[PDB]
Amino acid sequence: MNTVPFTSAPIEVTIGIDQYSFNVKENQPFHGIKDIPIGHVHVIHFQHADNSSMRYGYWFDCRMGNFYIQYDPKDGLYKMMEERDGAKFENIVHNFKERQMMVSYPKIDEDDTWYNLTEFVQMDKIRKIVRKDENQFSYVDSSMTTVQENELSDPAHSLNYTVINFKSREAIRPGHEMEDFLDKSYYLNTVMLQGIFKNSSNYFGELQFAFLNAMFFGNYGSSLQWHAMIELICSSATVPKHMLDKLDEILYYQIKTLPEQYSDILLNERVWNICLYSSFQKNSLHNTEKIMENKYPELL
Amino acid sequence: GAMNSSNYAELFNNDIKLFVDDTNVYRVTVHKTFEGNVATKAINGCIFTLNPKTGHLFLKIIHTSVWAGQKRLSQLAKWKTAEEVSALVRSLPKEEQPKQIIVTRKAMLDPLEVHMLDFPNIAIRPTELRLPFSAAMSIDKLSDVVMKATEPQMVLFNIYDDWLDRISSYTAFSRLTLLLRALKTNEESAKMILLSDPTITIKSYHLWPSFTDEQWITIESQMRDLILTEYGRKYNV
Numbered sequence: 151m152n153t154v155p156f157t158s159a160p161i162e163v164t165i166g167i168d169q170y171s172f173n174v175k176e177n178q179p180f181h182g183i184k185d186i187p188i189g190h191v192h193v194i195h196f197q198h199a200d201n202s203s204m205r206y207g208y209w210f211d212c213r214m215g216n217f218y219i220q221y222d223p224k225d226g227l228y229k230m231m232e233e234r235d236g237a238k239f240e241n242i243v244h245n246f247k248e249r250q251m252m253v254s255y256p257k258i259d260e261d262d263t264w265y266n267l268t269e270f271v272q273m274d275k276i277r278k279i280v281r282k283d284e285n286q287f288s289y290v291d292s293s294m295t296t297v298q299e300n301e302l303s304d305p306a307h308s309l310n311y312t313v314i315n316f317k318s319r320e321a322i323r324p325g326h327e328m329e330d331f332l333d334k335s336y337y338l339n340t341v342m343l344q345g346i347f348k349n350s351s352n353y354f355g356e357l358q359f360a361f362l363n364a365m366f367f368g369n370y371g372s373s374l375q376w377h378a379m380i381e382l383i384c385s386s387a388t389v390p391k392h393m394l395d396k397l398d399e400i401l402y403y404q405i406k407t408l409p410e411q412y413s414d415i416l417l418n419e420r421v422w423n424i425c426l427y428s429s430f431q432k433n434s435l436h437n438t439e440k441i442m443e444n445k446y447p448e449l450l
Numbered sequence: 451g452a453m454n455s456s457n458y459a460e461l462f463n464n465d466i467k468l469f470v471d472d473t474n475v476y477r478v479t480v481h482k483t484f485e486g487n488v489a490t491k492a493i494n495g496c497i498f499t500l501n502p503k504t505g506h507l508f509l510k511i512i513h514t515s516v517w518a519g520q521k522r523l524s525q526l527a528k529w530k531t532a533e534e535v536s537a538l539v540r541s542l543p544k545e546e547q548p549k550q551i552i553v554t555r556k557a558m559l560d561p562l563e564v565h566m567l568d569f570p571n572i573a574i575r576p577t578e579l580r581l582p583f584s585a586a587m588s589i590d591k592l593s594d595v596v597m598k599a600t601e602p603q604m605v606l607f608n609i610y611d612d613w614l615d616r617i618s619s620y621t622a623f624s625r626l627t628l629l630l631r632a633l634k635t636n637e638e639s640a641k642m643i644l645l646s647d648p649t650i651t652i653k654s655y656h657l658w659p660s661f662t663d664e665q666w667i668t669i670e671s672q673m674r675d676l677i678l679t680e681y682g683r684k685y686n687v
């Protein structure tokens with residue numbers, strides 16, 4: 151188990167760690183989060199009590215370094231940093247651990263939720279979507295735009311998701327206009343899976359990362375990306391059978407985890423009704439269709 | 451975006467544009483079968499592609515053989531229309547290619563946009579105007595060439611005959627739409643009005659009769675009377 155310690159908490163803030171969250175008061179004796187499960191990416195995120203503008207956070211993997219948070223009063227945010235002196239890092243954490251100044255990652259033993267949300271998410275793929283090569287961890291916030299969004303404006307601060315556009319030359323072979331527009335299998339299997347992602351695991355990783363950025367930061371371009379990647383699969387007549395089974399599991403756990411009260415803003419009615427009831431794969435998402443119908447029957 | 455009454459003069463400015471109407475592309479008769487089921491039989495159709503400024507009409511005849519062995523014909527008909535319009539644009543010299551294509555039915559938007567991806571600078575637009583171009587097959591010489599076709603064929607017409615020698619394209623388009631609206635609402639009476647006087651004839655190289663200016667005013671008045679008469683018969687007014 152690994153630890154993200156905090157030098158201090160000088161401003162009142164709601165801290166998220168994966169799907170969990172807790173409130174810290176101004177100048178409370180908080181010095182971090184312990185017992186973080188090894189083997190998964192994680193995200194530690196923030197919403198300031200006095201300015202809910204800009205949710206922001208950091209994707210990281212404790213196997214890649216020793217990372218801690220210190221508030222920066224100049225830029226006004228909690229920043230992740232890497233401690234390269236391992237002996238120093240261990241002593242500061244042991245001192246925090248001995249004085250019981252850390253919260254424990256509150257994982258229930260039965261509970262596979264975080265694994266199910268991050269099964270295909272890898273840090274190395276995150277670091278290519280979020281380009282800041284001098285850090286091993288990746289900053290995301292509420293307002294960051296996507297490359298595709300910027301095409302329709304600081305490129306250094308963009309989310310470089312794979313651009314999907316159903317009415318583009320990339321999606322449509324000359325001479326197969328009707329075929330390729332009504333059946334996206336070419337675009338899915340040749341352009342995207344074989345061509346760009348190399349395999350379905352990388353495709354699902356980006357899909358899962360897009361959802362998580364949408365949910366945890368309210369990042370609108372991430373929500374656009376998540377829906378586009380779902381629709382591209384559902385709108386293809388020819389999809390490997392293992393991909394559809396895995397998609398149903400992925401989506402089920404995303405819908406299960408979504409806050410009920412954010413459904414109006416995080417779920418696109420058109421895409422979901424198309425995917426569950428009209429598309430080629432309308433019958434291939436049994437688990438997702440059942441939870442959607444029982445939890446969000448209004449959307450449908 | 452969409453084209454309506456607020457930007458109607460845009461139709462007659464010097465930017466090349468075409469209207470595309472697909473109503474008459476897929477045409478069928480519906481009949482009982484020997485077993486008492488119902489079956490369709492297709493008949494020849496046409497794409498109506500019109501430059502509203504010059505009157506040039508690109509009539510692509512859609513021969514029934516294009517439907518042979520195909521499924522979902524009403525959907526295919528929109529994509530075949532978009533394919534043929536795209537092919538027409540590619541066949542035109544650059545300086546003759548349209549800057550905008552206005553489709554009369556919104557279901558043509560995506561098929562035409564997808565077929566015209568190679569032309570990102572040609573705007574594909576819908577219209578809020580209700581244009582009576584379905585009635586093109588009420589023009590005898592257009593109907594004749596469509597039904598007689600034995601293979602796919604493109605035939606070029608000027609739907610304004612020689613009217614632009616005497617009137618503007620705004621007025622010519624208004625006359626056209628009034629004539630087509632009348633032929634759509636009561637074809638028999640409209641044709642009666644058009645051929646009522648044997649003295650006025652249709653030139654071999656024209657579609658409509660050779661009316662003088664004063665006779666065209668009389669004709670236009672009778673067409674409006676027809677549309678109002680039919681509106682009253684329809685709604686009991």
Ligand SMILES: NCC1=CC([N+](=O)[O-])C=CC1=O
Nearest residue numbers: 155156157158218219233242
């Ligand atoms: N800058 C001092 C320092 C503080 C710290 N912490 O509070 O967690 C961690 C690492 C480190 O170098």
